[PDB]
């Protein structure tokens, strides 16, 4: 198909790559829905501790987004409703038990492409799969009444230690095709299936268009795909969904039941046997990674190391948009003149370290910042990792200074926190640009 | 004892890397940091510093032996502590003086200036950090070394202290410190000295550390007469292009040798610390303007016939292009802006060298002008990018 | 040629804002935004180009000693003549723009009330009188001085916009840091001092 | 009335808080004598213009208010220039075009329009005197520092023996150039707002 | 009410113009006197006559200083109003001035006035010296000076630079009392009657007759002074007048 | 002499400048009347020469807009959707109009200056704002420093009001003395404790002020209101008293007073969520209006709570009415707290700050505070404290209705 090659980026050579073979996985007894992963989500609860819930049953609604329902991935008893500072809903936890579930309408594989948009929207909202969609700009769940003319299906995963989408999709090719047909019916415009060169199941609808993206990590991001195919703005909003959610949509519209099975790459430098494992949405990571990690102080992350949630405490559960569990060591050690020693076993975008001389090396990366917090000195690292047609240095300076208008002018509305992960990685000042971008976007949305 | 917390933290972080871990997304971070960047830049000027000390000592000894001999030379040596200390530490001041004695004299002339600038600038930085409750940034090492390497060997210590005070406080600290200013601090201090005490940073009695010696430098000699006027009065030999390239000429400590500066610049550019685009723009501008002046010609201004390679090897052009024009904070933040910034620096430097009789060299003034005008270059580039975005990138 | 040299000197070598500190009030007040600075610079350019030649003609015809009549010199009316002429020109331009060219008035006519009695125009006219210029020389000098003022204000606006990331101590934030920035800009512009173009 | 007339000195400075009368402050401050004469001229011109505008404030047509005020200011400045040429010829020559530029000085016109137009003659005169006093305070401070540190002299009287005259002090040439006035005014504003935080900008 | 506006504006303009014109016309004479006395004080200072106060300056200048006009091309005295003469304006005017070629223009002055003004210091029915105004381009501006020459026309009694804009300390040393006093006793011309005054870098030999110590670190200003003197002692300058004076032109 | 020539030239130059300026004005400046269109209605159009402010022009025309701060760009309640014309948006206007509202076209009437043709759309509700001359009925003191005043419209186009709204009243120049104030013995003892009657007011300029209402919609042709005397602060008694407050306290029965039309958007949402009311002092008026509207006109079954904060027992009013309402309907529960009760009060119930006592008593054990609509009205400090407490309880701004102004 149409191929776009990315030259600027960074593929992190972190040790402990997955085996790319699907395993049965452990048994999960607790499944949680995280309330802080949904942008601008103020929850109105519909269940209480000890309540019995079925699969695909509403647990809470969104005050700011009326009609959006967040349903239970599993059937069982609500055990905890974790609320943090200012009573922010950290997570709703359910102990798994039973087979009771909610069911919906089902159609043949030859009818989905012709299904009514209103019916598709109603079924998705009722089942809770609607939350799979994310709107760019602002990376929020789309409004029920809203519609978009560009739906981006991320069929490729370039995140470090990420599962190969082809292996997962080959098992559920029929479900993927059904989901593509449903998305083609739902979209007012086109469905851009963004993938690597390797072949995938193909939909026959003229709306669905396959686009091949090549290059380092940023090539696999829906933000990059949107920038290169359907540039987004306040007047042009695109939707984003991943291949697993497309398979779930196809299964829902084919069988009438919510599909909560996921394939997640459990991989990291401190993982004995990194590989892909079957699990359930919101699965407890303390149980998923049980008896599989080397001894010592480690951090479990839902999502990639570049962009993920530290799976600890109430947040120790798989995220809604995460298909990966990364276990890393905690780099709290202090060494004498560490900043001056030759860079053997040290990774860097710059060539200031000896490590870059040894090609093919894999680094047992830790969670250390490799330096203190300093002011931003633009030595040119951001341009090496930003492929989008933007001025990363000036955009990041605007984000640091909190100039929302200038940031929007410079293209902050086309970006998600995952888009600035590599900028955060390569910053010598140790800025966390994802938080700055989120604050700027929140201010822009509140003002507009 | 919280008052000295900033100093204690600076010392502790210098000795040991902090054990801090990431708190949010991007749980892994790049190994490079400001400490390593600044230390790499600081080490990249070590060959230039050492050759500068050697050349200062050699030129001073040659001038002393050319002016005085015998008991008069002994009296001069006894009259100058820079000389009798070198003699005390085993360094002969005679004509048959070795590289060790020349380096020792260069050290006696350079280390006091470096220590003074470092102490004063560090005091100002520490005062600002303690009063404003901040941590100490790492760029002061580079600022101090670069300031110390671009001044005549015979600069008064109080003048050096005033210059570093101006460059640090007025150009950087009042703007928030490292990474928060628009001007080059070292060049700002040097310009303060330039425009406040010209007699000590210009003329014929400051570029050679010999008592009673008056000798013009290569740029001044070329201005007076032309290429044929390049003669080293101390040795009575013509100044060859090879001599100027290797650094066997009078001038500032760190500017003389283009070869050592090229080595250091190559290292830092390979490591990616210094922008090669700025260097390319500077070279393009210098070559273009020099060739234009050569083609136009002039029967009165000998400088009009200076070739681009002579421009490269003369003055502080190489030092400025490699270490002063590549300051990331004072340069443009876009690639096209960097190209324009370098071209402007080169053009302005050649223009000040040629059509400005007051100042033999203009690299510092050119870099200051380019620092002033770089934000406009990046603004133009950003406006073009914004127009493209509003056009949806042609979609 | 002579006119090219005069234009270059009046743009770079003879910079009103930094060399002569002319118009520094509006210079430091309107330099917050680059677009506003560009508009103000264009307004200053047009006002100077339309004022300096008219002032030159008036001076040659009347205020010059003995020009109007033998044994009579009216050089003591220089200041009022020039300032009144400038005030009339600025107001009539601002009104004709507001009437016939709404977009031109919006782009540039907004700043004209601030240029009505600006120090830059009066200083340029005073220097022109203190020197010896013809009509074409006065036109070129006015255009060049306006261009130099525009360059200075635009550079200051760019620097100030870049300083959004800076952390200026309180008390120095605003007017004081603008003054320090202007001083550094003057240092940078001193590079052309030795040129005798 | 003492507080009212002294308020412009520090509380509401025409150069430290208001951006007015900066050209003369930056240029004339090379010598303390020139700064003093400029201060006196500005005080006199501002006071007289305010007094006359207040005298005929009611009868001034609005359509030509700017021209009517500028005519009075220009006439006063012309008289002052002729006086400074007749006496203090050297000071007049040193001042050069800035004596004439006093007309376009922002302080005079701003005070005339804001205060003298809607105030009684004596209060307008006092307001002009106070504004000129504050402008002169700033000018005197800057000029004192510049002259002292650039020539070792105050009002032409040697205070620091220069090396060129067998002394011990080397004058700071930068104090006779443009950047010195800018830096001095910036740091003066810094000190003023440090001792009066209420004037700190946001 | 246009009539009221016209009445008020014309009345205000009338009163303002009345007072302005009265002040200007009344002070015209005082201003002219001030400028004249400013020139006279410097002329007397270079002549070597001590004068303090305006009255003393005027009296001494009238008693001793005698202005005269000299034509450069011929070197003979020319009748005219020497006292109220402006050589700068005359040079600026093309009709009364002459353009100089590149070879001729050693001092980098575009125009040369056809008629210059000199000052004879009368000791009483006798001239003791002649003061010549010279000027030449410096590094930053044009420097003007008065050179006092004995009646023999080959000795410098004193020199003073009354208008310059060079950098203080480096180029302003032309106004240094020691540097100016060093000029006394120098010979403008050698035995061959040619420009012999020289500014020598790194000082001058002790007992030298035509050598003057240069300005330390100010070679450009020293070169400007050298060019000024070389031009103004040549044929295009006061060369012919000095040659005439050497043979009793003044006496 | 040259004096005559100089004078002639000066006069000629000045006259030429003046004539040129006058001719330019005559031939360029348009003196035609400016037309303002309201909702594109020819009948509802205004014609006025350039100058002044749009708020003044509209007031002269007859349509009234909220002017709580009386100009100066402080309240921001004056908002008009100018579809075209009116110029750009001023920085002072931007302080209360967001970017989205500005894009929609909202502008401040008191800040926008009318100079050329402008078209603006105004909601029909504005046409319901009218100016009346009400008659006083009762001015009996209701507390130590809080009084109840009942102004009745003279049956002239009495536009129905909405619960929670406020009116605007203008008091011209006048002079009043605290002696004329009516104070029964119970409150007069406290008043004379510090001889507060020594104060007097002399207003030399008409003053316009906005005051909340206290009558539920079921009340026809009646405007009840509560007024708190703005006595000088105890720390600085030398300062003058409150102009409008003293004037209102100095009114007499039967006197005619000018009032404006309905204003404000402090209305209750048409939902079934629980309502919590936080009133204090003068806030009792709007809180009572809301409660009576919800319990009499609508008779809603929603759970309702009313927490009122009084400085002392003597400052408590409508206690009998609220107790009767609570007895009639258990869905409404009231709990008053005394922040600074006097020794004579002998209060045995809730004390302390209203927000703190409410948080400790009810919201602490509440399961879903975020689902409760919190209406509040009181002093600015009380409003800030309650808002901070609710935010700490994770209550969004949508469910919190307050008269920010
Ligand atoms: C929509 C709305 C509704 C309102 N509803 C009500 C309501 O229902 N009931 C109610 O009582 N109010 C209400 N108000 C408030 C009312 O509008 C007045 O602001 C308030 O009553 C004070 O009026 P005043 O005449 O005392 O004001 P002002 O004259 O502005 O202020 C007088 C007060 O200020 C003090 N003061 C002034 N200067 C100083 C100084 N330098 N130092 C110390 N003290 C000083 C005086 O001593 C006195 O206490 C409402 C306001 C709005 C906007
Ligand atoms: C102001 C107070 C004093 C401080 C000012 C500096 C002077 C004092 C400190 C100087 C340091 C060196 C100490 C003395 C070394 C003496 C070595 C010796 O044996 O004598 C000289 C010898 C060369 O001898 P030779 O040339 O054979 O001649 C002999 C007889 N003709 O020498 C050699 O063989 C070569 C030795 C060269 C040593 C001098 C050069 C040092 C440069 C490095 C300094 C860098 C520091 C700054 C950079 C950052 C540091 C963190
Ligand atoms: N916008 C509107 O429609 C209305 C606004 N108001 C405002 O309410 C004000 C009430 O004034 P008064 O009757 O004199 O009030 P008041 O003196 O009677 O006090 C009322 C309440 O405020 C509380 N309070 C005061 N300061 C507090 C603080 N720092 N923290 C917490 N609680 C605090 C007291 O404890 C008391 O419960 C009016 O002056 C006006 O500003 C009143 C009525 C209507
Ligand atoms: Na060299
Ligand atoms: Na030069």
Residue numbers in the entry:
A (entry chain A): -1 to 446
B (entry chain B): 20 to 414
C (entry chain E): 2 to 198
D (entry chain D): 7 to 208
E (entry chain C): 7 to 257
F (entry chain F): 2 to 406
Per the authors:
In the human pathogen Vibrio cholerae, the sodium-pumping NADH:quinone oxidoreductase (Na+-NQR) generates a sodium gradient by a so far unknown mechanism. Na+-NQR is composed of three integral membrane subunits, NqrB, NqrD, and NqrE, and three hydrophilic subunits, NqrA, NqrC, and NqrF. The six subunits NqrA, B, C, D, E, and F of Na+-NQR harbor a unique set of cofactors that shuttle the electrons from NADH twice across the membrane to quinone. Here we show that ion pumping in Na+-NQR is driven by large conformational changes coupling electron transfer to ion translocation.
We have determined the cryo-EM structure of Na+-NQR in the presence of NADH and UQ-2 at resolution of 2.86 Å, which was improved by density modification to 2.55 Å. The bound NADH is clearly visible in the map, and the nicotinamide is Π-stacked parallel to the isoalloxazine of the FAD for efficient hydride transfer. Structural information on reduced Na+-NQR was obtained by a cryo-EM sample with a fivefold excess of NADH over UQ-2, which presumably results in the reduction of most redox cofactors. Nevertheless, in this structure, NqrC resides at NqrB, like in the oxidized state. Minor changes are observed for NqrF, which exhibits less flexibility and in which the ferredoxin-like domain moved 2 Å closer to the FNR-like domain of NqrF than in the oxidized state. It appears that it is not possible to induce certain conformations by a certain redox state at thermodynamic equilibrium. In the cryo-EM structures, FMNNqrC resides in close proximity to FMNNqrB at a distance of 5.7 Å, compatible with very fast electron transfer. In the cryo-EM structure, FMNNqrC resides at a distance of 27.3 Å from [2Fe-2S]NqrD-E.
